[PDB]
C-alpha cells in the first residue's frame, strides 16, 4: 500500500483484481523514440480496491516521468473542486521522508513537499465532503503539521483539454514543469530534497459523476531517461 | 473493560449469531471487525465511523453481516466457513486497541441415528452386538438403557469409538430397551429403541 498510516476513510474496500495499466494511442532528460504511455488513473463511485495500491500502479520513479492528464472539469458533478487525479512522488511515504504532492483545487495546482504521514490507501475525491470530521483523512493524516520545504500554489488553466507535466530530480533537486498545450513548457517549481525519490503513485480519483456520463479519468505517463555527456 | 460475547457461542447452520459488545468506549474515531485473529485490512469485514454515523465494508464482507453503532456485528446465515475467531478493533485519536476477540463455533444439526441388532430375542449367556449407525461423523455417541445412561459395567465393551456396543454374557438384568443417542454442541437425537427379551 506503500503508506503506513491507517486513515479512517469514507470509502468501501474490496479485494477485486485490477486490469494491468492500459497502453497508449551535460545532463539531459528525455522520453524514448517510440515510447508508449500507460494510463494510471483509477476510479470508483463507492469503493476503492486493495489491489489498486500496489505495483504495477505503485511505480518506480527512476529518472522521472513525462505525463499528460485529461482535464475532467466538464464531466464532474455540480460542486466538484478536483478536476483530475492527484499524483504523489516520494520514497517510503513516511514521516521519515519527503513526499511531493501535486493536487488541484478549483483554479490552482496545490504543490507541496513535506514529511507526510501518507495513508495505506491514499485517495482523492472530485467533490470531497466530511460532515465536520477532522479525524477523517483522504490521502494523509498528520496530527502535527509536518515539516515542509515547499508549499506553493500555482495557477491551473481551468478550461483546457489536457495538462502536461514533467517531473524529474537531479543532484537531489526535484524539478517540476507544467503546460496546458504540448507546444509550450513552463517551469512550475523546483526544490532541493535530502532523500532521493524512488517511487510514485497516482491516487485513485473517486467521484459520483452525474447522469449517463463517461467518467474517464486518464493520467498517461511515460518514463524519462538520463544521459550525461 | 471491553469484553465481547457470542450470542450464541454454538450456532446451528443457517441460524444467526450476534457478536455482542460490552462495552464500547463512548468517543471513538472509528471501530472495525475482522475475520480471524488479525487487523489486516484484507480481512476487514465491515467498519463504522461514529462521528459520521456511516458504515463501510471491507474485503471479507460476505453480504450477510450488519455492524451496529453500538459495536456489535450480526451474522445472518452462518456457514461452517464463518466459524472461527473474530477481531474487533477500536481506534481513538489516533491509537487503536486491537483487543476484543471472540470465537464462535458452528455445527450441523444431527439426524436420527439407526440402531442395529444381531438377534432381537437373544438367549442367556450369549453375545450381543449393538451398532449405532448414522450420517454424523463428528457427533458424540452416548448409550441409553431404559431412557437413562447405560451403565458401563465390567462385561461390556465399546469399540469403533462408541459405535459398537458388545455384551458377551447377558445376565437377566440386561433386559430392556436399548437406544443410542448422538449429541453435538447444538443438537441431540435418539435412535429407535431395541427391546432385548433374554429368553
Ligand atoms: C446493541 O445492538 C444490538 C442490535 O440491536 C443488540 O442486540 C439485541 O438485543 C435486544 C435487546 O436490547 C433484543 O431485542 C434483540 O433481539 C437483539 N438483537 C438481535 C436479535 O440481533 C444489543 O443488545 C445492543 N445493546 C448492547 C450492546 O448493549
Ligand atoms: C492554496 O489554495 C487554497 C485554496 O483554499 C488555500 O487555502 C491555500 O492557502 C493556498 N496555499 C497557499 C500557499 O497560498
Ligand atoms: C489471538 O492471538 C494472541 C496470540 O498471543 C492471543 O493472545 C489471543 O488470545 C488470540 N485470540 C483468541 C485466542 O481468540
Ligand atoms: C449500514 O447502514 C445502513 C443504514 O442503517 C443499513 O441499511 C446497512 O444494512 C448497513 N450495512 C452494513 C454492511 O452494516
Amino acid at each position: 500500500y506503500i503508506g503506513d498510516f491507517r486513515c479512517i476513510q469514507l470509502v468501501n474496500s474490496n479485494g477485486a483484481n485490477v486490469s494491468a495499466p492500459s497502453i497508449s494511442t551535460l545532463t539531459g532528460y528525455y522520453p524514448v523514440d517510440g515510447s508508449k504511455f500507460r494510463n494510471l488513473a483509477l476510479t470508483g463511485t463507492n469503493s476503492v480496491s486493495l489491489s489498486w495500491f500496489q505495483p504495477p500502479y505503485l511505480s518506480q520513479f527512476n529518472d522521472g516521468i513525462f505525463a499528460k492528464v485529461q482535464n475532467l472539469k466538464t464531466s464532474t458533478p455540480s460542486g466538484a473542486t478536483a478536476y483530475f487525479p492527484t499524483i504523489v512522488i516520494g520514497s517510503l511515504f513516511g514521516y521519515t521522508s519527503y513526499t511531493v504532492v501535486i493536487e488541484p483545487y478549483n483554479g490552482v495546482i496545490m504543490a507541496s513537499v513535506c514529511q507526510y504521514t501518507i495513508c495505506q490507501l491514499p485517495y482523492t475525491d472530485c467533490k470531497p465532503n466530511t460532515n465536520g470530521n477532522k479525524l477523517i483523512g483522504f490521502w494523509h493524516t498528520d496530527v502535527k503539521p509536518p515539516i515542509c520545504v515547499l508549499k506553493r500554489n500555482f495557477t491551473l488553466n481551468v478550461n483546457a483539454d489536457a495538462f502536461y507535466f514533467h517531473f524529474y530530480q537531479h543532484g537531489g533537486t526535484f524539478y517540476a514543469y507544467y503546460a496546458d498545450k504540448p507546444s509550450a513548457t513552463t517551469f512550475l517549481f523546483s526544490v532541493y530534497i535530502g532523500d532521493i525519490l524512488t517511487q510514485y503513485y497516482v491516487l485513485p480519483f473517486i467521484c459520483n459523476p452525474t447522469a449517463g456520463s463517461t467518467f474517464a479519468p486518464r493520467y498517461w505517463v511515460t518514463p524519462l531517461v538520463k544521459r550525461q555527456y | 473493560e471491553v469484553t465481547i460475547e457470542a450470542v450464541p457461542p454454538q450456532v446451528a447452520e443457517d441460524n444467526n449469531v450476534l457478536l455482542l459488545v460490552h462495552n464500547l468506549p463512548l468517543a471513538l474515531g472509528a471501530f472495525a471487525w475482522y475475520k480471524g485473529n488479525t487487523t489486516a485490512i484484507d480481512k476487514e469485514i465491515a467498519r463504522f465511523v461514529p462521528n459520521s454515523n456511516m458504515n463501510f465494508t471491507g474485503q471479507a464482507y460476505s453480504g450477510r453481516e450488519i455492524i451496529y453503532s453500538n459495536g456489535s456485528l450480526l451474522f445472518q446465515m452462518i456457514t461452517m466457513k464463518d466459524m472461527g475467531v473474530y477481531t474487533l478493533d477500536m481506534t481513538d485519536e489516533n491509537y487503536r486497541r486491537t483487543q476484543a476477540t471472540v470465537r464462535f463455533h458452528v455445527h450441523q444439526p444431527v439426524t436420527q441415528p439407526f440402531l442395529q441388532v444381531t438377534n432381537t430375542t437373544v438367549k442367556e449367556l450369549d453375545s450381543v452386538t449393538l451398532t449405532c449407525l448414522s450420517n454424523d461423523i463428528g457427533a458424540n455417541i452416548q448409550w441409553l438403557f431404559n431412557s437413562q445412561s447405560l451403565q458401563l459395567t465390567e462385561r461390556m465393551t465399546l469399540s469403533q469409538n462408541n459405535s459398537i456396543l458388545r455384551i458377551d454374557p447377558i445376565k437377566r438384568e440386561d433386559a430392556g430397551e436399548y437406544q443410542c443417542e448422538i449429541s453435538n454442541p447444538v443438537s441431540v437425537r435418539r435412535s429407535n429403541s431395541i427391546k432385548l427379551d433374554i429368553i
Side-chain angles (χ1 to χ4, degrees), chain A residues 6 8-9 11-13 133, chain B residues 29 39 47 51-52 56-57 96:
Chain A
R6 309 163 147 297
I8 137 186
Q9 310 181 287
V11 64
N12 291 311
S13 311
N133 199 159
Chain B
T39 46
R47 185 186 54 147
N51 330 67
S52 320
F56 301 92
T57 76
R96 51 198 207 81

Side-chain angles (χ1 to χ4, degrees), chain B residues 115-117 128-132 141-159 162-171 173-181 190-196 198:
Chain B
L115 185 41
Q116 250 207 17
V117 285
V128 70
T129 48
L130 300 159
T131 311
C132 194
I141 354 274
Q142 184 161 338
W143 282 102
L144 297 160
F145 175 77
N146 292 330
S147 302
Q148 296 322 97
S149 282
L150 174 149
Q151 298 295 304
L152 48 131
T153 79
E154 55 175 307
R155 30 71 159 168
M156 290 165 166
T157 58
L158 23 266
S159 56
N162 307 148
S163 157
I164 307 175
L165 163 59
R166 174 177 166 265
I167 327 182
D168 245 9
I170 27 164
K171 287 189 181 180
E173 297 182 32
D174 289 317
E177 289 275 13
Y178 285 79
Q179 303 191 93
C180 62
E181 79 178 322
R190 301 196 175 199
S191 66
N192 49 92
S193 308
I194 242 74
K195 194 197 194 295
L196 278 72
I198 303 151

